Amino acid sequence: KIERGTILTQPGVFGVFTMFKLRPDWNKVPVAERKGAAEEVKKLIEKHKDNVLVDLYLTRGLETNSDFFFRINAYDLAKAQTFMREFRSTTVGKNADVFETLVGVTKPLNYISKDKSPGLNAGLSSATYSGPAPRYVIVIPVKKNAEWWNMSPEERLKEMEVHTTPTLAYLVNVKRKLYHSTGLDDTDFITYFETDDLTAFNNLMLSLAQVKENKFHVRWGSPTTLGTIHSPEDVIKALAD
Amino acid sequence: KIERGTILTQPGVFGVFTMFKLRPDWNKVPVAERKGAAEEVKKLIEKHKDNVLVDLYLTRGLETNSDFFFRINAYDLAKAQTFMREFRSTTVGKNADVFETLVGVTKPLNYISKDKSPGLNAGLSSATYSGPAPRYVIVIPVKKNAEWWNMSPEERLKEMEVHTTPTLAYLVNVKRKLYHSTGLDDTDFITYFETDDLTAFNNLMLSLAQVKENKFHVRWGSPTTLGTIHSPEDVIKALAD
Amino acid sequence: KIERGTILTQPGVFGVFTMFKLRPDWNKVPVAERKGAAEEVKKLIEKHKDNVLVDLYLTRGLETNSDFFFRINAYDLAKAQTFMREFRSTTVGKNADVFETLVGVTKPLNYISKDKSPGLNAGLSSATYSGPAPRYVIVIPVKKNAEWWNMSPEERLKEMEVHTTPTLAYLVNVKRKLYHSTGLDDTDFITYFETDDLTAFNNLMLSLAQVKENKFHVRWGSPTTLGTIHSPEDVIKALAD
Amino acid sequence: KIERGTILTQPGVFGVFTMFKLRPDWNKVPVAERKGAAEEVKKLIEKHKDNVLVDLYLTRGLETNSDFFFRINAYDLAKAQTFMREFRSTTVGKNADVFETLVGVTKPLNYISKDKSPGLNAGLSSATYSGPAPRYVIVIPVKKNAEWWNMSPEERLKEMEVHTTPTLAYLVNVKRKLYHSTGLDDTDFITYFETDDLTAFNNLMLSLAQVKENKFHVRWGSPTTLGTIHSPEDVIKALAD
Amino acid sequence: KIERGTILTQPGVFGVFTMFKLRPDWNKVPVAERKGAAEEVKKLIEKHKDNVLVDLYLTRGLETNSDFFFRINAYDLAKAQTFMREFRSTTVGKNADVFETLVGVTKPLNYISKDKSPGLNAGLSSATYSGPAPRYVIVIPVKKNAEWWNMSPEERLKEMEVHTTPTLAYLVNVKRKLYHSTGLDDTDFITYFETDDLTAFNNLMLSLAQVKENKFHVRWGSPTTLGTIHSPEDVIKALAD
Ligand code: HEM
Ligand code: HEM
Ligand code: HEM
Ligand code: HEM
Ligand code: HEM
Ligand SMILES: O=N[O-]
Ligand SMILES: O=N[O-]
Ligand SMILES: O=N[O-]
Ligand SMILES: O=N[O-]
Ligand SMILES: O=N[O-]
Ligand SMILES: [Ca+2]
Ligand SMILES: [Ca+2]
Ligand SMILES: [Ca+2]
Ligand SMILES: [Ca+2]
Ligand SMILES: [Ca+2]
């Protein structure tokens, strides 16, 4: 069994973000098969109720290299693979090419833990998202250079302490999730955000762009994917027409 | 209501620039459907009269990677997405792939404000385009490095006063708009220009090329998109034949 | 005569990794010919029983630029070429495009030999892979800068003693092979790994990212290819439906 | 009214270089339709007699990303666009994709003028190409870094005095033209050469690679395009069979 | 009249390497029109007996961006262009795309000449290949940065003497030819090697990776193309099934 509330909260959970782009011969799939496409994803998601957690986002109209993207969470990478492999046999699956994939895994806190930084940690755990259900999702893969990794844990802590300080306040505004990827894919992290206030999201990044940590990014985006939040079937219904 | 005068002047407005390139199988769409294309787009813009402001520009013949491109203003990002999504269902939308998308948001003045640089700010707001209606649009994404962002807001202000000084002069010549994107897309800024004097515009960029601020750019173009200003139906009427 | 146990163990063995991505018109091959494509690969591999050693891995659903990939080991690169060349004339072969090829050769120990680093040689050669038959494969090309190659062998040795130290604890966890490539292809090394514990593997790579040697990487990934271990016939069966 | 010798000599002239690549489906336009492609171009050039000056060069067999490319000179970038747009409606235009476009504008001398550098300006102005009519063309876009641009006019002049010293000699061999692009496209300059001696031309670039100015180049080719000079109809005749 | 022993030995000789990749619809050419395509290439080469020297190498199975590549040598670049242009009119030619082209020209010795470096120059000319017919070809484009070219010829000579000292030994083992490209394409040099011993050749690159000269390379491969030597008619016969 796989419960949303738990799997998104736990360490050892594999995140698989996959960005698809619809090929032009999709508008030539017969309106009938295309309308029936949504139910098919919905049943596929149900059929794996117990193997993976599925999220699906709409980026068509906001992104060059994707029309929609999935966020799979799984206790087992192989199972996230099997879902995706089966998704690609779907009617929509057979009509979209993959433009991005990011594999990461969840871990315990490395810096702002109860032990190491109790002060900021109390802040982080007891802060609570306010106001409107988030209409937008942002996914940003982030990779830091060899210099970063070769600083001592004390120095890296200091800098993550600096990361946390202006950002804790945006927790009323923005939901966050951090996956780890070094060794597993071509990035060090995958970050995932949901927010209703894009102006606030901009200011949040500017905050972080402005601290020493930013000096070690060799990837911070590329792509920065920002699309819009819906139910799996709605995304597909919107792709259809 | 979305008044062109107001929406282009206020903060918190989203710009979505989208560069499209026609596929070769557009020449094989029946000269009939193709000529009906312009009206279809015109009608679409009318339907969305009240959700977004639409601009369309012709780059075919001047750009490797776009035949035409839209500028969308919205108070709601989701609404820009809806329009664009509906554009790509159109006859022309169906025969063009996306080659670039930039999402950005309008903000208040950060440096050359009434508070921070009163002298320059006055020259700025009391400067006024003179002469022939501009025929040319240039759009330029700009990203600055971590080192810039790690400068003190005092240091960056001084640099931006340096940016404003030799450029005020070109406000009779060149119209400008600034969008902010850090965290929203793969750029710090989206800059937008209308001019009738390209040689002037060349001198303008050289001016800015020669100051310290330039030292921090990691993207300043790529693509630099210069195309030609027309009414939306006219852009589509030119892609017809 | 080619025994798996010997050829994977010996110096002067050529490795050729080739990532394939299936074209969309494979979904349009008659489902009958697609199911028959597995036996075909299986018979070809029997055909070169004595020419090459063949492994094949499933990356569909986990990788943007491959659905599958081969590892060929041969005593003679020409025989590797024939094999690969004959595969591409196979039914699946005719429906996939090559997206990456790494050519490499197996060499004797340059650094952590018994002569040069006795103590760590002992460690490495004594503790053995325990733990479950590995489900995951990882393939990482690595290339170091000219600064590295210009350091004295005495300096590079010290650096590789520092690489070795943290890895010793993953000897029960992770299986490794190293091919050499400088001058034969666009990388210095091809690294190959098999594991069942991806979190462990992530930890390993973090340990490596954090030593001085990481300072010299100009390539360490791109792509980092991670996918799944199965019998060649099973991989092609997996691609069929 | 547009005389070749005038427009190639004057400031304020727009250059539009466009490198085209024929698609496979051109070898399947019937020979007959393909051979009538040459007159269609020839007739388009005569049609635009008074709007633009057209040059066409053969690159097939010599360049990966072009079979041919145009050089258009205009007093009006808008008129370059129109011509280009109309060429792309041509039989040949319908079977080729654009792969590079460079926009630029002619200016007066910045450095080696009569005022600033009288000695060298004399030497430049009073020198004239000798011997066999040039068979080869080379087009090379150049971009210098923020550091170049932040040097003083005095420092930059010294460096261009350095550029000009070893190159004057090659004016007996090589014809040149200098377009300016900063802010108009993704390059600072577009340089244009005609020669019959490629070994000379090679010695010319090495002369230039060897000086300080070459230290600030961030683009200096890419693509370096070398092809062969013919009348416009002769270029389309060649591409036909 | 073009003699292989002579043209490969003389200065002022144009080299034009071109890497081609067969398109998927080549498997749909009726086998036999395919096998008969070798005859066509053979005839084209004899038709150009007097114009160019032709070589053909098989890379299918070992390279991502080529199935085969040509080496053309000519006294007149134009004639190489005609040859190539006429090859692409060929049956195979109509089914392949070009993925790479390098143009360059033979020159007299710059560094290791009797006058400048008398001893090594003697060692060079009086060195003679033993061992089997080479099976392998490698083609490596090399570009050095502005810092190299800004070194005085004294300093560069020293460095080329350093390149040449550990490499002479490999002349019994490996065959080399050096072409010059600065200004003619997007590389400083094209290097061409024929060997039968690939472990040797790896060791040869590492020798050269480890000298100061390597510090100045900005391109040294990309692509490193290693393929398999045969007669022209044999390479096409091979591409056929
Ligand atoms: C505004 C809400 C945010 C908060 C409260 C926040 C807080 C944190 C905290 C507490 C950590 C340390 C976790 C640990 O070590 O266990 C962390 C790490 C990290 N954060 Fe954020 N962050 C926020 C926004 C962002 C944004 C906008 C980004 C940009 C993409 C980002 C990217 C990252 C990355 C890549 C790491 C891992 C750093 C490392 O590997 O050492 N965060 N963040
Ligand atoms: C010639 C007329 C121009 C004038 C009067 C002008 C003025 C200004 C001013 C006053 C600001 C600061 C606004 C603020 O922070 O609130 C600014 C910002 C900016 N300008 Fe311009 N500018 C001009 C042309 C250009 C050009 C040609 C470019 C090149 C694309 C450019 C790029 C930018 C960028 C990227 C910013 C944001 C800088 C930052 O993030 O701190 N401007 N400009
Ligand atoms: C975890 C188990 C590992 C062990 C026991 C191990 C051990 C070693 C040893 C002993 C050598 C020296 C061999 C020689 O000089 O002959 C070596 C070289 C090398 N290793 Fe690993 N390593 C491990 C994991 C990794 C990982 C995760 C990577 C990164 C992908 C890696 C990359 C490399 C590379 C690129 C070289 C060649 C270094 C050079 O050229 O000088 N190893 N390794
Ligand atoms: C031997 C023939 C050449 C001569 C006589 C020559 C001369 C000059 C002169 C006099 C200038 C300054 C013009 C001015 O500032 O008003 C100049 C500028 C320039 N040249 Fe050449 N040049 C030659 C060949 C080349 C070559 C092979 C290149 C390489 C592509 C090149 C690239 C450029 C560029 C990019 C500029 C503008 C520099 C700047 O913006 O400050 N030139 N050349
Ligand atoms: C082992 C056999 C080799 C020998 C005997 C050899 C010898 C030489 C000599 C004598 C020169 C200078 C010739 C002149 O200046 O006119 C030269 C230049 C050069 N070699 Fe080699 N070489 C060998 C292998 C290689 C290899 C493996 C490479 C790697 C790609 C290479 C790359 C180059 C390049 C790029 C140059 C031109 C340097 C420059 O432009 O100034 N050589 N070689
Ligand atoms: O720490 N936010 O991924
Ligand atoms: O700051 N001009 O967008
Ligand atoms: O470094 N083991 O590939
Ligand atoms: O400066 N030669 O274009
Ligand atoms: O110097 N070998 O090309
Ligand atoms: Ca984006
Ligand atoms: Ca290669
Ligand atoms: Ca990957
Ligand atoms: Ca442009
Ligand atoms: Ca070229």
CA dihedral sign of residues B26, B27, B30, B35: positive
SS3 call for D177: strand
Count CB neighbours of A240 within 10 A: 16
Q: How far apart are CA D173 and CA D190, in angstroms?
A: 20
Whether chains C and B touch (3+ CB pairs under 8 A) is answered by no
Q: Hey, of A208, A224, A229, which one would you mutate to test binding to chain B, going by the most B CBs within 10 A of its CB?
A: A224
Comparing alpha-carbon positions, the chain A residue that sits nearest to B146 is A215
Chain B residue numbers with beta carbons less than 8 Å from the beta carbon of D150 are 210-212, 214-215
* Experimental approach taken: X-ray
Q: CA of E200 to nearest chain C CA: how many angstroms apart?
A: 10
Taking CB atoms and an 8 Å limit, are E198 and C77 in contact across chains?
Answer: yes
Measured by CA distance, the residue closest to atom 3 of ligand 10 is E178
End-to-end CA distance of chain A: 35
H-run or E-run covering B118: helix B118-125
Between strands A53-58 and A225-229, the pairing is: antiparallel
Cα C45 from chain centroid (whole Å):
18
- Ligand 11 ion local residues (Cβ < 5 A): A 224; B 185
CA dihedral sign of residues B41, B43, B48, B54: positive
Taking CB atoms and an 8 Å limit, are D61 and E78 in contact across chains?
Answer: no
3-state secondary structure chain A: CCCHHHHCCCCCCEEEEEEEEECHHHCCCCCCCCCCHHHHHHHHHHHCCCCCEEEEEECCCCCCCCCEEEEEEECCHHHHHHHHHHHCCCCCHHHEEEEEEEEEECCCCCCCCCCCCHHHHHHHHCCCCCCCCCCEEEEEEEEECHHHHHCCHHHHHHHHHHHHHHHHHHHHCEEEEEEECCCCCCCCEEEEEEECCHHHHHHHHHHHHCCHHHHHEEEECCCCEEEEECCHHHHHHHHHC
Which residues, other chains included, contact E104 with Cβ-Cβ below 8 Å and sequence gap of 6+?
A: E14, E15, E16, E179, E180, E181, E184, E185, E187, E189, E190
Count CB neighbours of C166 within 10 A: 15
Nearest to B100 by CA among B60, B139, B51, B55: B139
C-beta of residue C196 within 8 angstroms of C-beta of residue C135: yes
Q: Separation of D28 CA from ligand 15 center, angstroms?
A: 27
End-to-end CA distance of chain C: 35
Measured by CA distance, the residue closest to atom 3 of ligand 6 is A178
CA distances from B169 to B50, B173, B234, D83, E207 (A): 36, 8, 32, 33, 59
- At CA E222, angle to CA E220 and CA E226, rounded to 5? 90
C-beta of residue D63 within 8 angstroms of C-beta of residue D139: no
Q: How far apart are CA D7 and CA A47, in angstroms?
A: 71
Q: How far apart are CA B223 and CA B220, in angstroms?
A: 8
Nearest to D197 by CA among D171, D217, D177, D222: D171
Q: How far apart are CA A27 and CA A23, in angstroms?
A: 8
Structural domain boundaries in chain B:
1-241
Q: CA of E106 to nearest chain D CA: how many angstroms apart?
A: 9
What are the residues facing E52 on neighbouring strands? E74
A interface with B, Cβ–Cβ < 8 A, is 24, 27, 58, 60-64, 135-136, 138, 140, 198-199, 201-202, 204-206, 209-212, 214-217, 221-224, 226-228, 238, 241
C-beta of residue C58 within 8 angstroms of C-beta of residue C68: yes
Q: How far apart are CA A23 and CA C107, in angstroms?
A: 45
Q: How far apart are CA E221 and CA E191, in angstroms?
A: 10
Q: CA of D4 to nearest chain E CA: how many angstroms apart?
A: 26
Which residue has 């990044």 as its token pair? A205
Do the annotations mark residue E185 as ligand-binding? Answer: yes
Residue environment code for D93-129, b if the CB has 16+ CB neighbours within 10 A, otherwise e: bbbbebbbbbbbbbeebebbeeebbeebbebbeeeeb
Cα D48 from chain centroid (whole Å):
20
Q: How far apart are CA D109 and CA C133, in angstroms?
A: 72
Nearest to C233 by CA among C48, C70, C41: C41
The CA R_g of chain A, rounded to the nearest whole Å, is 19
End-to-end CA distance of chain E: 35
Write out the two tokens for E145. 């940065």
- Which among B63, B212, B228 has the least Cβ separation from residue D78? B228
Determine if ligand 4 sits within 6 Å of the CB of residue D88: no
H-run or E-run covering D232: helix D232-240
Q: Separation of B161 CA from ligand 3 center, angstroms?
A: 52
Write out the two tokens for C194. 């098999």
Resolution to 1 decimal place, in Å: 3.0
Q: How far apart are CA D100 and CA B62, in angstroms?
A: 10
Do the annotations mark residue C163 as ligand-binding? Answer: yes
Count CB neighbours of A81 within 10 A: 28
Measured by CA distance, the residue closest to atom 31 of ligand 3 is C191
**Burial class (CB within 10 angstroms; exposed 0-12, middle 13-18, buried 19+) of B61:** buried
Measured by CA distance, the residue closest to atom 4 of ligand 2 is B167
Residue environment code for A192-204, b if the CB has 16+ CB neighbours within 10 A, otherwise e: bbbbbbbbebbbb
Q: How far apart are CA E59 and CA E68, in angstroms?
A: 5
Chain E residue numbers with beta carbons less than 8 Å from the beta carbon of D211 are 150
Which residues, other chains included, contact E8 with Cβ-Cβ below 8 Å and sequence gap of 6+?
A: E53, E73, E177
Q: How far apart are CA B184 and CA D60, in angstroms?
A: 42
DSSP string, D179-227: EE-BTTBSSSEEEEEEES-HHHHHHHHHHHHTSGGGGGEEEE-SS-EEE
Give yes or no: E176 in active site.
Answer: yes
Nearest to D207 by CA among D162, D156, D155: D162
DSSP string, chain E: ---HHHHTTSSS-EEEEEEEEE-GGGGGSPTTTTTTHHHHHHHHHHHTTTTEEEEEEE-TTT-SS-SEEEEEEESSHHHHHHHHHHHHTSTTGGGEEEEEEEEEE----SSS-TTTSHHHHHHHHT----SS---EEEEEEEEE-HHHHTS-HHHHHHHHHHHHTTTGGGGGTEEEEEEE-BTTBSSSEEEEEEES-HHHHHHHHHHHHTSGGGGGEEEE-SS-EEEEE--HHHHHHHTT-
Between strands D189-195 and E14-22, the pairing is: unpaired
Q: Phi and psi of E42, rounded to 5°?
A: -50, -45
Q: CA of A185 to nearest chain C CA: how many angstroms apart?
A: 5
DSSP label at residue C1 = -
- Output the CA torsion B198→B204→B210→B216 (10° steps): -90
Q: How far apart are CA A175 and CA E209, in angstroms?
A: 48
Look up residue A49 and give its amino acid.
K
Q: Angle formed by the axes of helices E37-47 and E77-88, to 10°?
A: 160
Comparing alpha-carbon positions, the chain C residue that sits nearest to A149 is C210
Taking CB atoms and an 8 Å limit, are B80 and A61 in contact across chains?
Answer: yes
Candidate from D163, D175, D218 with most ligand 4 atoms within 8 A of CB, to mutate: D163
Residue environment code for D65-85, b if the CB has 16+ CB neighbours within 10 A, otherwise e: bbbbbbbbbbbebbbbbbbbb
Write out the two tokens for A6. 């738990």
C-beta of residue C171 within 8 angstroms of C-beta of residue C128: yes
C-beta of residue C7 within 8 angstroms of C-beta of residue C73: yes
Which residues, other chains included, contact B161 with Cβ-Cβ below 8 Å and sequence gap of 6+?
A: B111, B112, B117, B120
The ligand 2 atom at the shortest distance from the C-alpha of residue B148 is: 41
C-beta of residue A153 within 8 angstroms of C-beta of residue A225: no
The reply to whether omega before E223 is within 30° of 0 (cis) is yes
Q: How far apart are CA D68 and CA D46, in angstroms?
A: 20
Pocket-forming residues, ligand 7, beta carbon under 6 Å: B 176, 178, 191
What are the residues facing B17 on neighbouring strands? B71, B102
Write out the two tokens for E8. 């490969």
